[PDB]
Amino acid sequence: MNIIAILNHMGVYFKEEPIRELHKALEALDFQIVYPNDREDLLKLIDNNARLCGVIFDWDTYNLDLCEEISAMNEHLPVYAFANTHSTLDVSLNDLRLNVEFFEYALGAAQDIAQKIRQSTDAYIDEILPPLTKALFNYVKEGKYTFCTPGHMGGTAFQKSPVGSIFYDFFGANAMKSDISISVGELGSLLDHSGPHKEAEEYIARTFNAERSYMVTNGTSTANKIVGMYSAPAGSTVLIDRNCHKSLTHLMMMSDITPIYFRPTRNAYGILGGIPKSEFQHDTIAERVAQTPNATWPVHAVVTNSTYDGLLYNTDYIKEALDVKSIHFDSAWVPYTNFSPIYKGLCGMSGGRVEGKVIYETQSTHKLLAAFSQASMIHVKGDINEETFNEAYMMHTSTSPHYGIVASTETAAAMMKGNAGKRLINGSIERAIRFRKEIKRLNSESEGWFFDVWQPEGIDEAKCWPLDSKDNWHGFKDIDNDHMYLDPIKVTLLTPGMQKDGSMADTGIPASIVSKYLDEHGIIVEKTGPYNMLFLFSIGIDKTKALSLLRALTDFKRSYDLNLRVKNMLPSLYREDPEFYENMRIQELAQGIHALIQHHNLPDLMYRAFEVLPTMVMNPHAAFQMELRGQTEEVYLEEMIGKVNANMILPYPPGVPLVMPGEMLTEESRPVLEFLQMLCEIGAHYPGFETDIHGAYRQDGARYTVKVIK
Amino acid sequence: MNIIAILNHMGVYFKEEPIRELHKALEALDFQIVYPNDREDLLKLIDNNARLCGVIFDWDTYNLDLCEEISAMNEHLPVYAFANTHSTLDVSLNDLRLNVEFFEYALGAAQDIAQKIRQSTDAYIDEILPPLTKALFNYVKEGKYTFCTPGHMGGTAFQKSPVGSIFYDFFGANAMKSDISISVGELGSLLDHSGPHKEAEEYIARTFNAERSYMVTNGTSTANKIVGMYSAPAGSTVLIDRNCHKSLTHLMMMSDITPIYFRPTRNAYGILGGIPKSEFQHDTIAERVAQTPNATWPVHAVVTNSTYDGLLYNTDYIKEALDVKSIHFDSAWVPYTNFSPIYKGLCGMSGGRVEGKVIYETQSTHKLLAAFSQASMIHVKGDINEETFNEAYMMHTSTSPHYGIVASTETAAAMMKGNAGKRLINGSIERAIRFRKEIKRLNSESEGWFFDVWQPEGIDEAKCWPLDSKDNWHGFKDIDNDHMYLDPIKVTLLTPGMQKDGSMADTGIPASIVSKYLDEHGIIVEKTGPYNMLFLFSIGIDKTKALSLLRALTDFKRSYDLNLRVKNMLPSLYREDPEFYENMRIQELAQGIHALIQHHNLPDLMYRAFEVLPTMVMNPHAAFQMELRGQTEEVYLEEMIGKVNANMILPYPPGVPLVMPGEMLTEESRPVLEFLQMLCEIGAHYPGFETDIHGAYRQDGARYTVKVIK
Amino acid sequence: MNIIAILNHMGVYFKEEPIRELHKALEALDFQIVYPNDREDLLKLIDNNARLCGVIFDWDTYNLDLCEEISAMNEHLPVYAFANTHSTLDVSLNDLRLNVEFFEYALGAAQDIAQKIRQSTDAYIDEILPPLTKALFNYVKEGKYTFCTPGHMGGTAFQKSPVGSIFYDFFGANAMKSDISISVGELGSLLDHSGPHKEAEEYIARTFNAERSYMVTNGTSTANKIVGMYSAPAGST
């Protein structure tokens, strides 16, 4: 952050010679000088380069409205205006609001002006940096000797070893030097919420519209565990979204709590819909409590918002209708909701505090914002026992937190702020919408089949698109109005193979093949269903990557229409089993997998399996205790009925948990088992295309076994 | 890893000209050429610079025994011998065992030889790198486009923001690019133990003498929780070292397990000793089980080995004597035991598998080896249910592990290997012993008071020094023989203020003052007790730092003997409260704190408090559950008697937990309360010297409150 | 304080290449490097040049008694000893009393060592400077804008005039910038004996074996008048 732009090159020596002297003086202070040709050049340079730290221009040539244009992009960016004919009589109050510093043309004054610019640059950096990150950077500059943990002593131990020196050279000196512990009292303590850590927490809470915020260095899995254990004492009843991350299941195995499940919807593609508005009603919950052994009125509820596929709830209705004093939105997929008006009312922190309730949001800062893996945020709005919550927090936080992860959390919060952050979020949303429109246009232009995007017909402006009962693009039967919305950021592409009425088609291209092709050409997709692919158009996606994705998709279409050999299109798949893929073309593999899916009736079987709920003989805690005591055995899928499952069965082709520990299948829940059996067969017909049944163990002979209670 | 050493320059053109041509060709391949003057220069240059990647020398000038000398330092370092008069008849089998590649002198052959050297360098790097780290580095060089988590997309999002660009420039491009997720299938999955992750786990298990190893990215706290949950089902009885990390208490609050406590010893300094051999006996354990309600024969025992102060147990006796089927050594402080013969029989993984038992060792790779914070290892020797253990493991591991942390764990294992790693450990041990001897020598040289090191009188060779009953240096009364040993790496310095018979002294310098002084001069200590300081002489400590520490200690002695003002000697302490420290000298502050300690009788009170155990009305799980349900009140210290504590009380001057949740004080346990009642008073007399009572809360009025069961 | 002396030039690459790299790194931090030929040359160089701010030498070649010799001329002068064969077992208490900082020979470590030497030089300067003078120099480095007396505003008025510019060029920028008043509260007040002025007075009293000391800016004529008027009331002898 050392680039200074100097705008003009005038015709008078008394201005240019001081400017040349200042350029030399700034180069002596380790600044890189750039020379935009005109105002538009300068604006584009600021727009494309976040490392610009100052702008120098002639006030006679350009009015202070140029400073307003600069401020609209970055209101903190320092601008240095050189005054010759303008006086103090020529500045208005609004002009004085801008971050402009005035100088004069004089020979021999370059040193002092360069010093002033250096100080202004330091002030700008200090202003945009968040407090904990700034403290960490300063301490690293201090360079003290440590006889304390961590043992590498700021990277010395790495430098004393050959392989260690390779590691040190890869990760850099600063990363090693910033790996410190609480022995450094100047930075405070994460566990004690002291010093710069406390200010970082307050900074994050202010930025994310939370009454209070907590930094978690073991991911939203740990954040969910902290919130759930604070909110759900042993022997209590909890409402759980059946579309829940496995961390909630880990929490249920942690302590004796009786769950009652919200029932979500799904479409023909297996895209997970939202929970219907009825499930949040008092009567439904009371009936489920009555019909569930050892169940009382729930004291805590957990809802996944948004879904993996980008479906956001109307959270105001959930807050008003759900008669439980503790509501927790697992918002791991949407940490950006506070930073765009399109998400208003669609997130847990939206609005003010709810009377008689506490609201939690768990956010994965690493997933959709810019932070290191395992960085996570807990946001609280409402009354909590802060001391008790602190002990719940300490029970899952390491005594030696990774300071880089913590700093990355704070820095993501800081990036979210100001005109620059607003531009980043808005640009990501606009880029995603432009890509969606382009996919639609290409689909219209294609003579034959082309990729389609799962979205409403006439999307024009940036907003979350409601899912309406009249519109059938979403594929959800009898959906409630003003309930679910589509996040523009989560782009779902659809391959051919499904009809508009929810039925399958004669020909189709499984999305796994497209995913493998994209991976071969350097594009990693987030998630691949049977006929859908998910692309996260986050703030890390730029125009280059979007155009690259369009090129790769059209390249796949051209290669597929050319009936290329598998050995050519998919070298890695061929390397999996050269004998199997020796000669058959890509169309043949696509049609074979499509025919397997159709004959096994994957969509209908999946929908029926996830429509019915297996009976709960015992809660997950009891099942895990039985497994720990050894009272379990391994049986094949054939003997699933009548046996209580010990492990969460999580089929990955659907991707959502299907069986919970303590649940068993019966005659009514027979379809579930059937679907599972189907998966096994699908895994035994195409190497490289292996079905994943988490919680089941792949035994020799192309079969699966599951642990059940003895 | 690009420095090539060329040894000699003989007076013949037919060798010099090919050597210069090769030097130019190697410079063209991005190698840095260095020119040692002689054999000793080359050996020292290898010794001081781990970034060397090859050695070139003339076979006529130097025999192949030089290669043996090189190999003794680094057996993988490639050596290139140029043959002129020697033929294939002049190499023995032992010479051919060395990593020597032979070349010939010829004009115009520099390009081919440089290519051969480049390939040999690549082979060397591939050989020393561990598998997961190598895979990660290769993938980073691949440069794929990602539409998947993490959201920063390899650092693009950071580069699009000003503050984000500062963060990116600090941490470097590679750290951002290596932050990936399981969407990159070619690196496998930590949770599934697949691909390079499985190879990394097997590599670590081989390196650390474990049957099975697991990588944990949330610290030894999480590792302890995983082992404890796998080993201790709800309703079971568990043996816990009373000198246990707070993670074991977190596990106790996690599940309904009844603890029975091993009682450790301590000396006058508060240095925690070991559990006596009687407490591992069947009769003592059976009596304890009969004594406490709801207790059965323990199914799991946890022992801290070593102690924070470097006391290692004879683990063979513990394994043989302890009649519990599952033994877990919390070895967070000693991850290096397998890599030096001095630690044989003093660690959990020592020896073979114990019949009828499983042995666990939890290691903090970041604390004493070279790894990032939160990197931890679980080592298992014995039979476990792998599937169930995997369930416990995934219940505590994030679904998005930080790949840098994992790679750092693997890289610490790799650094531990070979002649280079053996030299690293041995050099650390020798450096610590040299520092200990120098402290003794300086103490003898000083006419007045000087720092003393807590160790036996006549230490000569590198070994763990046994704690014998005849010797009184350790200060433990009636200690068992062949039971506890001192780790040379953990250096405890003692300040004056304590006598050799365990009684206080009229004059004394509290170690907190020395610690503050050292911090002011850029030296961070690990732990500061009342009159002891702990210095970790890890592999990250070099001779420069040790000499700096000697200089700082001598400077403190000189300043203290000169009776300097606090405003000058300790500027930060003065800035804490200028009015209080306006004019007092350093000797006055030292004597005031010493007098407070003496009058309150800190040593005797602390020892008596930790000698007697509070009664356990209920296990920590029950107290934690009652805390969650709101059945708790805040009372002052004066009301500890008869009130069941809700939270673990961890006084910092001792540093070890004093009261567990569910424990209460009685007339027999009265001294504990008194000790606590003193600590606050000590913290109320000096603004910069505050006593920390963890689990107690400091509010207005300079007092402490503790939550107790209503 | 920007001249650093490097004593010797041995015959081993593993020492000389780190020394050359450190020389470049110190030149990058605005240090002037000088190379005495031997110990006597170094001692004479220290004796004749008070601007020397540090000495670098090889511990294998020279024992720490050389430091003692240096300390006999300037006990605050920082000396940097490079250790190769000597360990912590080879230093006595008396040696540790000297102002010696130890380093090691390693390629690529020149940046960190140069940073350490820069910090040690700053500490040396801070140690020898008296408190008020140090405060004045620091404030001049601050470079604030003044709308207060004196009227030249740190020399701006001089620079705006031809004859004033001659005067400013003669006396230098620092002399103009250090001409301040009590409007600058951080330096305290001479009249009120506050802030750095009080510490300067105590410093002078300690140095001159006085119970109390006062600073007079109008000469011993004024000092005599102050003492005499305090001591001799009207009508006395």
Side-chain angles (χ1 to χ4, degrees), chain B residues 34-35 37 41 44 48-49 434-435 437-438 441-442 445-446 542-544 546-547 550-551 554 558, chain C residues 11-14 83-84 86-89 91-93 96-100 102-107 199:
Chain B
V34 296
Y35 287 101
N37 291 317
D41 193 4
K44 277 296 311 148
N48 290 345
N49 301 274
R434 282 188 312 259
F435 184 89
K437 288 177 185 158
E438 163 73 359
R441 169 250 197 107
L442 295 174
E445 272 176 26
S446 89
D542 63 347
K543 186 214 313 297
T544 293
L547 288 161
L550 289 174
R551 283 277 290 108
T554 296
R558 162 169 56 201
Chain C
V12 283
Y13 183 93
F14 87 93
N84 166 48
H86 305 284
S87 64
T88 55
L89 279 173
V91 288
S92 81
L93 199 31
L96 287 165
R97 302 222 164 82
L98 305 157
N99 184 26
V100 59
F102 295 95
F103 292 117
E104 282 169 303
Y105 295 108
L107 314 164
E199 310 149 79

Side-chain angles (χ1 to χ4, degrees), chain A residues 49-89:
Chain A
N49 303 275
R51 272 162 189 89
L52 201 277
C53 62
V55 175
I56 297 166
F57 80 97
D58 180 70
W59 193 3
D60 285 348
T61 312
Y62 303 95
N63 292 330
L64 296 194
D65 84 311
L66 165 68
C67 293
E68 250 203 317
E69 279 187 326
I70 288 165
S71 186
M73 282 188 278
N74 183 351
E75 77 258 47
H76 303 300
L77 186 68
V79 184
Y80 311 108
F82 273 74
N84 166 47
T85 66
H86 299 108
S87 63
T88 55
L89 278 175

Side-chain angles (χ1 to χ4, degrees), chain C residues 3 8 12 33 47 70 78 83 87 121 127 146 171 175 203 219:
Chain C
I3 300 168
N8 266 35
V12 283
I33 307 300
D47 178 45
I70 290 165
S87 64
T121 312
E127 148 56 32
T146 73
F171 273 99
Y203 184 93

Side-chain angles (χ1 to χ4, degrees), chain A residues 1 50-51 74 124-125 128-130 137 140 144-153 156-171 174 176 178-180 183 217-218 221 225 229-230 233-234 245-246 250 253-254 333 366-367 369-374 385 387-388 391 394-396 398-402 404 407-408 411 414-415 424 519 522-526 535-536 538-541 544-545 548-549 624-625 627-628 647 694 697 707, chain B residues 1 50-51 74 124 128-130 133 137 140 144-153 156-171 174 176 178-180 183 192 217-218 221 225 229-230 233-234 245-246 250 253-254 333 366-367 369-374 387-388 391 394-396 398-402 404-405 407-408 411 414-415 420 424 519 522-526 535-536 538-541 544-545 548-549 624-625 627-629 694 707:
Chain A
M1 167 99 51
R51 272 162 189 89
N74 183 351
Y124 166 59
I125 290 171
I128 62 176
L129 270 180
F137 290 178
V140 163
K144 295 182 171 224
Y145 285 161
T146 65
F147 289 79
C148 59
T149 70
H152 61 78
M153 300 316 183
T156 298
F158 288 107
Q159 298 189 280
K160 298 304 183 160
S161 155
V163 64
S165 64
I166 299 166
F167 194 86
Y168 180 99
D169 286 347
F170 181 88
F171 273 99
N174 283 339
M176 257 66 171
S178 65
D179 191 46
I180 59 166
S183 286
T217 64
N218 203 29
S221 312
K225 266 182 231 69
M229 197 192 302
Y230 171 77
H245 190 259
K246 74 215 285 323
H250 297 338
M253 308 165 57
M254 206 48 108
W333 289 116
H366 59 89
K367 275 181 173 172
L369 288 181
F372 290 135
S373 297
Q374 286 175 216
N385 191 308
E387 292 74 20
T388 295
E391 71 62 8
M394 266 177 321
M395 294 173 66
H396 302 272
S398 164
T399 41
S400 319
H402 190 278
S408 84
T411 291
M415 289 163 59
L424 205 60
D519 196 280
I523 287 176
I524 315 323
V525 317
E526 164 66 27
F535 300 86
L536 312 167
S538 75
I539 53 159
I541 302 289
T544 293
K545 291 178 208 185
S548 178
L549 175 52
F624 187 60
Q625 287 306 310
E627 211 220 328
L628 283 175
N647 274 333
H694 216 69
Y697 308 102
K707 281 149 131 270
Chain B
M1 197 54 93
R51 267 164 192 86
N74 181 353
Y124 166 60
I128 63 174
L129 269 180
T133 307
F137 290 179
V140 161
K144 260 142 190 263
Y145 284 161
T146 63
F147 289 79
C148 59
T149 70
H152 62 74
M153 305 312 195
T156 303
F158 287 109
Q159 295 184 285
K160 300 302 184 167
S161 155
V163 64
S165 67
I166 300 167
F167 194 87
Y168 180 100
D169 283 342
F170 183 86
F171 275 96
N174 284 335
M176 260 60 165
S178 67
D179 190 51
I180 60 167
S183 282
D192 310 320
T217 68
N218 204 30
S221 314
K225 272 184 227 65
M229 206 195 294
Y230 172 78
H245 194 256
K246 72 214 285 323
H250 296 341
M253 314 168 51
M254 209 43 96
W333 290 116
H366 58 88
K367 273 182 174 171
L369 291 181
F372 291 138
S373 299
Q374 293 179 203
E387 289 62 65
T388 305
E391 295 311 38
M394 287 181 312
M395 285 175 66
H396 277 279
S398 162
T399 40
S400 320
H402 189 282
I405 286 165
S408 83
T411 291
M415 289 168 51
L424 210 54
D519 192 298
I523 284 175
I524 307 331
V525 316
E526 164 69 24
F535 300 85
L536 313 167
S538 77
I539 50 159
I541 302 289
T544 293
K545 290 177 204 177
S548 174
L549 175 54
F624 167 62
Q625 284 308 306
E627 224 269 33
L628 285 174
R629 283 177 228 143
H694 200 111
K707 287 172 162 184

